């Protein structure tokens, strides 16, 4: 439900929407390279990146909400 | 008029209004002459409206008065704008008649089979012997109500609030909503 407000917050944070989404794709593919746990069930790498980034913004969201 | 033209019904133009005389035929251009015979038109006949039958029924019940025996299109347009006021006034008069008469006398309108006296005095004088309170008498009265009478009474259901006038308009009046029997007879359409 709420996760898209975090997305919008991060969209509001980053100075280019396309550059933000590129950085999310990069972060996810480097995550799925630096860690080889399968990590593909009820929680997804994209949501993990969004969660970690909103936690950097200081906001109490768990991994994949 | 000048006073009491606020509130109550009154003639829209004030009485003693002036009238004028205009160009007769042969004083007028050919395009502005009334024809020497009244021409047939499909529109020659006043359209029958719900608002005409209701406004006539209100006029005959004295709730309203009209400038003539037939409601004008102006009057029916105003009824169209204001009918809910008269409907709620009739429903309020119906509630007040219920409160006065009591449920036996009120609902006996829809129990033709209930021949006994239904006035509050008679309900009391019957409770003073038969031991049946007003409620048991009312249950008995409704126990004499036929299914068709009950379905008609269901207009008085507190959720339906059917218009007390629409419940009591007779067939020869309701007919005027569509304008009497169809000219082409429906028996031509009826199929078993």
């Amino acid at each position: 439900k709420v996760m898209t407000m975090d997305i919008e917050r991060l969209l509001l944070s980053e100075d280019n929407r396309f550059e933000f989404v590129n950085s999310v794709a990069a972060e996810a593919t480097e995550y799925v390279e630096k860690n080889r746990d399968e990590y593909g069930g009820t929680k997804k790498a994209i949501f993990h990146v969004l969660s970690n980034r909103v936690n950097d913004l200081g906001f109490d969201r768990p991994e994949a909400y | 008029d000048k006073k009491l033209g606020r509130p109550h019904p009154f003639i829209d133009p004030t009485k003693k209004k002036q009238i004028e005389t205009t160009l007769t035929s042969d004083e007028s251009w050919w395009n502005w002459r009334k024809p020497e015979k009244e021409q047939w038109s499909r529109w020659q006949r006043r359209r029958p409206d719900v608002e005409t039958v209701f406004l006539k029924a209100m006029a005959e019940t004295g709730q309203v008065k009209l400038y003539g025996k037939e409601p004008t299109l102006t009057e029916t347009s105003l009824y169209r704008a204001r009918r809910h006021l008269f409907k709620e006034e009739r429903l309020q008069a119906e509630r007040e008649r219920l409160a006065k008469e009591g449920p036996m006398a009120f609902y006996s309108e829809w129990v033709k089979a209930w021949k006994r006296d239904t006035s509050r005095e008679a309900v009391q004088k019957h409770f003073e012997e038969t031991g049946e309170d007003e409620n048991t008498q009312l249950i008995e009265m409704f126990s004499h109500q036929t299914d068709r009478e009950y379905r008609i009474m269901m207009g008085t259901d507190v959720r339906i609030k059917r218009d007390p006038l629409a419940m009591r308009m007779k067939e020869d009046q309701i007919k005027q909503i569509w304008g009497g029997d169809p000219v082409y007879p429906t028996i031509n359409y009826i199929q078993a």
Partner: protein, 113 residues
């Protein structure tokens, strides 16, 4: 909302609710209908809507309280003390329209906690 004027009274000549949940409760309990006029204490007395219309009437009491009456709302205020309250003349429908948007903003921003 309301039927106005000639559509509402047959001749020429309303509850007060201390908050909108009292009005919604009275509606649910069938004390008032969706179309029917009521007065809501607009204690959020900012943000009053208007049509640039001067007061339709004002009443001054000898003791210096006065009531300003408008086509949409009333204000009670005094030369001593201050404004007590605005009362807005409204409907359960208008109340519900406003309330459900305010509560949608609150329900969204609940996650801001």
């Amino acid at each position: 909302g309301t039927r106005r004027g000639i559509c509402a009274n047959r001749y020429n000549p309303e509850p007060f609710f201390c908050n909108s949940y009292d009005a919604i409760g009275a509606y649910r309990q069938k004390r008032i209908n969706l179309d029917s006029p009521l007065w809501l204490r607009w204690q959020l007395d900012q943000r009053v809507i208007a049509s640039k219309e001067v007061p339709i009437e004002v009443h001054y009491e000898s003791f210096g309280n006065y009531h300003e009456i408008y086509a949409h709302y009333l204000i009670v205020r005094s030369v001593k003390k201050e404004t007590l309250y605005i009362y807005i003349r409204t409907t359960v429908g208008h109340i519900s329209f406003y309330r459900e948007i305010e509560e949608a903003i609150q329900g969204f921003s609940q996650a801001c906690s």
